[PDB]
């Protein structure tokens, strides 16, 4: 059922967990570094888990897709063919920016965070800077122990702050990916849908130095030896069975002004969905003629596709449950309740008004702010602007450098510049620049930016073409030039004739001022948000509703049972899919083109000791009433005894709108069954060595 419960809320859910069927004690679960919770790791944007004492980690195919893509070429396309390292020495690097974060400690710092904020006084900008200064000092102190990375999280609008400390593994290697026609069976056609038939898994291996301390890639590194790992279920999962997930959901907005919801539904989602689809079509067309563009842009295309379909799903869901209407009515009820407490309600009423005025301020420049940011996120302009900003920040003492541009961020920046090599073709990027320039020119006068207008020198197709021709002379297209600029000083940027660099230098003062404006609005938010949000929680509580913070990338628990759902009268979705369902969707064409070994094994009813007699087949995916969001891809799904029965990977179509308004009747997790992982690795793309290492071969 509903709720992305923080670990500190365990006492409050212990009863509900037991009732739903958990057989471990709640104390066993409350040990976040013990068995089984210490097996669960964060990847940054996805979850994963250790499944062997020798550092083997399982996650979803879509979470590992970037890594697989970085190791693929047009001639040797791992996304298509899969990957299997017969011995640990055959494992390839997942890339310099790949990470496994292993939880070490959590500390409440609410009181100190709030003191630092109050010491700033009445000034909004100083308030943001106080918090940033507080965070940076706290993080620096925490990260004094080498090999750790720390993160400060704000919960419930800034009513609570917790510091997480994680062991930061920096040498992550790809151990196994099934072929893409299994790992992403059904592609974008089945994405966000049930029935689903997707083998959404892949394996990494975590490495550390010989001293046991995290290190970057090196052939002298050895497998990390985790304190805890998960074991596969020995009992068959069935309909009605208890399941729970631990993971790192990224963002929800169930606590939101109606006007925030309205802006998102009517502008933000449709705008982004449209831009993503326009860019998908260009890259798709270009890749049909050029297999290098096809492979190098595959990971980018996967996100554009996933995000734009998610946004379409939300808009449809909003219309299905009248979300606008629910947001309006709820807000009116809360404002009513506040007015009826007289004096005591006044500060939440005032905060509401302040939040609403801040939303209007950001609304006034939204077309500009979005268009500029996505224009600047094409490969060469993004590189130029990032690197030129780093050169500005390096002249300051580290403690005053913008977050993202401190010494602790240098590894990531550097890695990003190398990874780009496998994600950039000039002729493709030029079409993307052109798209963004064309969109820029359609902006009205009051949303334009002098520096870009000037650089463009014109307002028509001929000007667009002349800027593109100028930008094409950049040298930032090679990895070696990008790294040269990574180490260079500000004066060297300001002297360059590289036209991408020249653009960056010209627009930088504008980006910095827009940034200050955003930090200023953010400081007024720091004052107003906690007060309104605490009032929303208090009201939810007086209505007897579940109270838990919106997602924010930290560790949460959700629990429930295996069950289907009913999308319309006269029909139901069943909780499982089966092998025979996979073959029934076969067409021989991407994305419905299973490996011939899969088709042969199913026709021959080779079930591999994994059949669930109750469904007559090996199960493939299943549905459950857990409450997950982006970031939970890859999370282990545990049964009553804390054994692995699956991985979380998707939601059904009707579920995605629960990001704003939760609907219990059609919100389900889609997970891939542990037995289908094992089946694929026995009968279709064999990895006997991995099955042995996890004691199931």
């Amino acid at each position: 059922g509903e709720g992305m419960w923080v670990p500190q809320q365990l006492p409050e859910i212990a009863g509900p967990l037991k009732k739903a069927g958990l057989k471990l004690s709640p104390q066993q679960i409350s040990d976040l570094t013990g068995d089984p919770m210490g097996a669960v790791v964060a990847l940054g944007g996805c979850t994963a888990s250790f499944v062997s004492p020798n550092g083997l980690v399982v996650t979803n195919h879509a979470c590992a897709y970037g890594a697989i893509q970085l190791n693929s070429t047009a001639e040797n396309n791992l996304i298509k063919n899969g990957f299997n390292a017969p011995t640990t020495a055959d494992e390839v690097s997942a890339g310099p920016n790949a990470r496994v974060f292993v939880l070490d400690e959590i500390t409440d710092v609410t009181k100190d965070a709030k003191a630092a904020i109050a010491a700033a006084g009445d000034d909004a900008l100083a308030r943001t800077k106080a918090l940033e200064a507080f965070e940076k000092k706290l993080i620096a102190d925490c990260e004094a122990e080498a090999g750790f990375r720390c993160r400060l999280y704000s919960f419930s609008g800034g009513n609570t702050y917790r510091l997480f400390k994680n062991l930061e593994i920096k040498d992550v290697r790809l151990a196994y990916a099934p072929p893409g026609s299994v790992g992403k069976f059904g592609g974008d056609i089945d994405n966000w849908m049930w029935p689903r038939h997707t083998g959404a898994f892949a394996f990494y291996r975590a490495y550390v130095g010989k001293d046991g301390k995290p290190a970057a890639f090196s052939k002298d590194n050895v497998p990390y030896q985790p304190k805890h790992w998960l074991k596969f279920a020995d009992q068959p999962l069935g309909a009605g069975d208890f399941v729970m997930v631990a993971g790192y959901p990224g963002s929800t907005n169930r606590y939101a002004l109606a006007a925030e919801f309205d802006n998102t539904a009517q502008w933000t989602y449709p705008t982004i969905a449209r831009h993503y689809k326009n860019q998908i079509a260009m890259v798709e067309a270009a890749g049909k003629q050029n297999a290098d563009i096809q492979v190098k842009y595959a990971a980018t295309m996967a996100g554009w596709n996933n995000t734009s379909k998610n946004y379409d799903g939300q808009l449809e869901g909003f219309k299905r449950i009248d979300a606008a209407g629910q947001k309006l009515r709820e807000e009116a009820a809360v404002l009513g309740w506040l007015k009826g407490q007289g004096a005591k309600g006044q500060p939440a009423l005032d905060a509401h008004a302040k939040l609403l005025d801040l939303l209007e301020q950001s609304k006034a420049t939204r077309d500009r702010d979005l268009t500029l940011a996505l224009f600047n996120n094409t490969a060469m302009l993004g590189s130029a602007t990032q690197l030129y900003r780093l050169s500005i920040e390096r002249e300051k003492p580290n403690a005053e450098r913008e977050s993202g541009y401190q010494e602790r961020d240098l590894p990531a920046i550097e890695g990003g510049l190398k990874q780009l090599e496998r994600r950039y073709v000039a002729a493709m990027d030029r079409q993307l620049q052109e798209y963004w320039l064309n969109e820029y020119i359609k902006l009205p006068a009051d949303q334009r930016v002098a520096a870009v207008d000037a650089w463009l020198g014109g307002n028509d197709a001929a000007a667009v073409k002349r800027a593109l021709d100028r930008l094409a002379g950049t040298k930032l297209g090679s990895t070696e030039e990008r790294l040269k600029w990574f180490a260079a000083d500000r004066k060297a940027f300001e002297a360059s004739n590289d036209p991408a660099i020249q653009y960056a230098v010209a627009v930088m003062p504008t980006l910095l001022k827009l940034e200050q404006e955003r930090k200023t609005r953010a400081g007024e938010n720091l004052a107003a948000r906690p007060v309104y949000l605490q009032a929303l929680a208090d009201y939810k509580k007086s209505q007897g509703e579940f109270v838990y913070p919106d997602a924010n990338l930290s560790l949460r628990i959700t629990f429930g049972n295996v069950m289907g759902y009913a999308p319309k009268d006269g029909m139901e979705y069943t909780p499982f899919t089966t092998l025979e369902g996979v073959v029934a969707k076969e067409t021989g064409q991407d994305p419905f083109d299973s490996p011939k070994a899969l088709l042969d094994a199913v026709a021959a009813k080779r079930y591999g000791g994994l059949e669930d007699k109750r469904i007559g087949s090996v199960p493939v995916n299943y549905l459950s009433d857990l409450d997950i969001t982006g970031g939970n891809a890859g999370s282990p799904v545990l049964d009553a005894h804390g054994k692995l029965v699956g991985l979380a990977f998707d939601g059904n179509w009707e579920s995605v709108s629960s990001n704003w308004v939760f609907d219990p009747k059609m919100t389900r997790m889609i997970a891939v069954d542990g037995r289908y992982l094992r089946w694929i690795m026995q009968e279709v793309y064999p990895a006997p060595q991995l099955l042995k290492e996890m004691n199931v071969g």
């Binding site: 979803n60 959404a200 963002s251 996933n306 998610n310 998707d650 939601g651």
Partner: peptide, 6 residues
């Protein structure tokens, strides 16, 4: 696919 969006 429930990967983190941005």
């Amino acid at each position: 696919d429930r990967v983190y969006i941005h």
